[model samples]
Target chain A: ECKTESNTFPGICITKPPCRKACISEKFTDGHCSKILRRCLCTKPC
Target chain B: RECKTESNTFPGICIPPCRKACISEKFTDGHCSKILRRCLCTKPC
Candidate 1:
């Protein structure tokens, strides 16, 4: 069972393009660029 | 196809470990943290 979000995963990326742009502005040093914007528990019965 | 939006891998930090906080408060940088503070994303998935 592959447990991974398919559409706009949480920890993967954020929806807000502006926010993302801000994070990248800092060169990702702020550690906010990769923050979990949202999550979708994609779980297949184990 | 290398599309993954579920592991905090945008290009910076996501889960910032704190010292005072018991449960991870998603610590973030000032410029970045401040911005994230406004984030309305769900806590967990």
Candidate 2:
């Protein structure tokens, strides 16, 4: 599995849209804000 | 001083480094773990 969060995702992860956009821009398949970490984790199945 | 985060990534894709994201997180620097490839950030500890 691969989960590379966006390097440019500023501040706390409030929603998925911004994170998703940033992840896609970062070349990841998708993205979601982690509840525990309060940050985005880009996802791509191995 | 040192700290880390499991936010980078694992294998299966071109492993991205953690330095930049770590910076976004207000860390000084970071890198990928040798085996797990996790986003290991660097910070004051």
Candidate 3:
């Protein structure tokens, strides 16, 4: 598995559909926001 | 994705069952590194 970060708000990356799509395009399985910086967290299975 | 070798631990960012399920489905071994705050998937079964 893997993760990526985005400066965008966690809600946007986690709630919006497009960000998830973008994550998947990059081969991530899912995307969400972090607690500390509210950064987008993207997940992938390697 | 990012895994750490440290023994320190904290609450990670992903949901429990969701992350667990995600990891279980794809990896023979998986874990959430609280210190790294990321998913760690290992070789497939």
Candidate 4:
């Protein structure tokens, strides 16, 4: 399963390309921001 | 792991400064968090 990035702290919840780029660097095949929460989540077969 | 602004006490100065130190440490990317202005350094897992 994918996980969130420092979701415990406060953020404005924005979605951007950097979000995806950042996620991939984490080794995820693909990445995107949560449309609802706008948090970075990496998805795999899990 | 994480980062903070040089002074860590300003209205809206985190954005331009945070990136400097983050990448300096060899992180993938860095940005100043909104509202909270916390510096987040992106790292490759």
Candidate 5:
């Protein structure tokens, strides 16, 4: 989905990865990791 | 509340940091922070 869509929280743009590795990775710090996981396993990601 | 959930996999426990950050680090694109940003953000001192 990786589309630079606008959101209520400006400055922050929501996009999607074409694939799994597109966004998620091991280097992501705890905060990023958490947010990503929440977005994937819990929220979006098919 | 990070509870190990029950899954078809050998070990599956769906829990939380649910506020965020449960299993996110594994496939994370970056590194885990030391302060109140990621897990440490909500972790107990």
Candidate 6:
């Protein structure tokens, strides 16, 4: 996951754009933000 | 750290070991997990 946060709450990643952006920004595919938690987690299906 | 990792399991595809090494070197894991945000996954449910 990317560390880019949209909420700016210091651990709460409610949105998917910022997180996804960071992930993809790093060239990772299928970027997304963490759910129910305060973190960004990016992933790619192989 | 520049977030560089080497893995034999995945040639071009990113793997957990890569992220693990990255995280170890003061880099984010990139959300590599066995269940959540995994690279190689199967619908075993």
Which candidate number would show the highest DockQ if scored against the true structure? Answer: 6
Stretches of candidate 1 off by over 4 Å are A1-15, A29-46, B1-45
Scored by lDDT, the top model is 2
All candidates: TM-score:
0.18, 0.48, 0.37, 0.34, 0.14, 0.37
For model 3 the local lDDT of residue B33 reads 55
Which pairs in model 3 have colliding backbones? A1-B1, A2-B1
Clashes of each: 8, 1, 2, 0, 20, 5
Among incorrect, acceptable, medium and high, the docking class of model 4 is incorrect
Question: What DockQ does every candidate get?
Answer: 0.04, 0.08, 0.06, 0.02, 0.06, 0.11
Residue A38 displacement in candidate 6 (angstroms): 2.9
lDDT of predicted model 6: 0.43
**Clash pairs, model 1 backbone:** A9-B5, A10-A38, A11-B7, A11-B8, A12-B5, A12-B6, A12-B7, A31-B13
In model 5, the runs with Cα more than 4 Å from the true position are: A1-11, A18-23, A27-46, B1-45
Q: What is the per-residue lDDT of model 6 for residues B1-45, given as tens digits with 9 covering 90 to 100? A: 122222224334443555554445444443344433333322111
Isolated chain A TM-score, each model: 0.28, 0.81, 0.57, 0.53, 0.14, 0.54
The true-versus-predicted C-alpha distance at residue A26 of model 3, in Å, is: 1.3
lDDT of 4 by residue, A1-46 (tens): 3344532223534765666566567554455666675666554322
- Tell me the alpha-carbon RMSD of every candidate: 14.5, 8.0, 12.5, 13.3, 14.4, 9.8
Compare the candidates by TM-score and give the number of the best one.
2
Candidate 6, residues A1-46, lDDT tens digits: the string is 2222232223556787777776666555544555555476555332
Q: What tens-digit string does per-residue lDDT give for candidate 2 at A1-46?
A: 4555567888889999999888788777788998777877676542
- What TM-score would you give candidate 4 relative to the actual structure? 0.34
DockQ of 3: 0.06
Task: Please report, in order, the local distance difference test score of every candidate based on alpha carbons.
Answer: 0.29, 0.65, 0.47, 0.50, 0.24, 0.43
What tens digits encode model 3's per-residue C-alpha lDDT throughout A1-46?
Answer: 4554532433444453666666666556777655655456666553
lDDT accuracy of residue B21 in candidate 6:
46
Which ten-residue region of model 6 chain B has the weakest summed lDDT? B1-10
